[PDB]
Amino acid sequence: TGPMRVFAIGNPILDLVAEVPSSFLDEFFLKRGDATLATPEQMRIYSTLDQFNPTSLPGGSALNSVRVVQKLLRKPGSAGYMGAIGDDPRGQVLKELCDKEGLATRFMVAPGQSTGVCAVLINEKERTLCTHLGACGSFRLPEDWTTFASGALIFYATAYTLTATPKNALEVAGYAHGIPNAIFTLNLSAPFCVELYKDAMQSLLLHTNILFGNEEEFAHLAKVHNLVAAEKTALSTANKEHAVEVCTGALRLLTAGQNTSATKLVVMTRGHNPVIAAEQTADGTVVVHEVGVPVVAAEKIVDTNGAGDAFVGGFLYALSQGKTVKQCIMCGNACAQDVIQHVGFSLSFTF
Ligand SMILES: CN(C)c1ncnc2c1ncn2[C@@H]1O[C@H](CO)[C@@H](O)[C@H]1O
Ligand SMILES: CN(C)c1ncnc2c1ncn2[C@@H]1O[C@H](CO)[C@@H](O)[C@H]1O
Ligand SMILES: [Cl-]
Ligand code: NA
Ligand code: NA
Numbered sequence: 001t002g003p004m005r006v007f008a009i010g011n012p013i014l015d016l017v018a019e020v021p022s023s024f025l026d027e028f029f030l031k032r033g034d035a036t037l038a039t040p041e042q043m044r045i046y047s048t049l050d051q052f053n054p055t056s057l058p059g060g061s062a063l064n065s066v067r068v069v070q071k072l073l074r075k076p077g078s079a080g081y082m083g084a085i086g087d088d089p090r091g092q093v094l095k096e097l098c099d100k101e102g103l104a105t106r107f108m109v110a111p112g113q114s115t116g117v118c119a120v121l122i123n124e125k126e127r128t129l130c131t132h133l134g135a136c137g138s139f140r141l142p143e144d145w146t147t148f149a150s151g152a153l154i155f156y157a158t159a160y161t162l163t164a165t166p167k168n169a170l171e172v173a174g175y176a177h178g179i180p181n182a183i184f185t186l187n188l189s190a191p192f193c194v195e196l197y198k199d200a201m202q203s204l205l206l207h208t209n210i211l212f213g214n215e216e217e218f219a220h221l222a223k224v225h226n227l228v229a230a231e232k233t234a235l236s237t238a239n240k241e242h243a244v245e246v247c248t249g250a251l252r253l254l255t256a257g258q259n260t261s262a263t264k265l266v267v268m269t270r271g272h273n274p275v276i277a278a279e280q281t282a283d284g285t286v287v288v289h290e291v292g293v294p295v296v297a298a299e300k301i302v303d304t305n306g307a308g309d310a311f312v313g314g315f316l317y318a319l320s321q322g323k324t325v326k327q328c329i330m331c332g333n334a335c336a337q338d339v340i341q342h343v344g345f346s347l348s349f350t351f
Contacts, residue, residue, distance in 0.1 A: 068313025
């Protein structure tokens with residue numbers, strides 16, 4: 001019942017979270033603390049996980065981010081989402097978890113395929129993630145998606161959606177492009193997305209209003225698109241000056257040297273270090289933002305998985321409220337810091 005403020009596409013994934021012994025990692029040839037896609041030899045990891053009584057929680061990067069938006073906006077249908085699920089029990093579990101939070105969803109069913117699943121394996125204070133996309137790969141944006149999304153001016157896709165087809169994110173960005181107050185936003189998602197989808201992502205960036213990413217994603221973006229000279233490509237983004245150059249070079253992938261009234265903004269999260277952003281303002285001049293990250297002691301950080309997803313959700317919530325760039329970054333920081341200080345990738349009940 002709306003009004004819908006944010007619309008996103010994603011890979012809808014059920015997260016199965018469990019504490020496992022080290023022999024479980026070893027049996028399945030997992031490297032502790034990595035996040036991978038399930039290999040053939042890892043086929044039975046999800047069924048085998050049942051002996052460790054896992055918890056079932058909604059996951060998927062973009063779904064995490066819009067669930068943050070919906071939690072903060074509170075009214076049912078404040079955020080909308082589409083993706084593909086299987087015609088299996090897991091898909092029903094995920095759908096019902098999303099419905100109970102009031103999110104507006106349309107999940108396309110792929111007969112015969114299994115709903116996306118991610119094993120979140122806890123072991124010696126580290127998370128090890130193993131994801132099987134299944135039905136997520138079948139997603140094809142329906143012809144009436146703009147009607148489902150009616151009223152939303154903020155659109156979001158993760159570069160992870162390119163693994164089904166880049167056409168979904170290109171269609172969503174294509175609708176927003178050239179509309180001064182339609183904002184298409186994109187997450188770089190992972191280093192591999194930057195290389196694997198280089199030319200589709202170059203086109204997509206020309207249609208993008210806000211680009212989010214972390215340091216390693218942007219390092220890969222700078223290398224693949226020659227954004228900085230060879231001599232700078234291995235420089236640390238923990239260095240402010242380097243981070244600023246990378247963001248400023250990435251901004252040209254969004255603006256193509258043009259200046260309109262549309263939003264054109266690149267945001268680099270930097271872990272504990274200040275968020276850095278480069279913005280093309282109304283008259284074409286580029287402004288650089290630096291927003292300090294409140295200190296959180298090592299002892300209080302449970303896990304940083306999901307921090308970026310929550311950052312983006314907080315940023316888009318604040319953007320829907322007409323807040324400034326710096327306020328949107330501060331909201332993203334607040335959401336991310338909540339999530340890293342407890343188990344789970346959702347905002348706390350009391351947030
Ligand atoms: C395409 N891949 C690898 C993925 N596509 C979308 N979401 C993913 C993902 N691999 C892991 N996830 C989700 O990442 C969240 C933590 O940031 C987890 O909820 C997990 O489901
Ligand atoms: C000490 N560390 C690692 C950190 N301390 C404080 N905030 C953190 C953080 N690592 C990440 N965050 C927050 O999550 C966002 C996305 O990584 C960072 O922008 C920051 O808000
Ligand atoms: Cl996603
Ligand atoms: Na402008
Ligand atoms: Na957490």
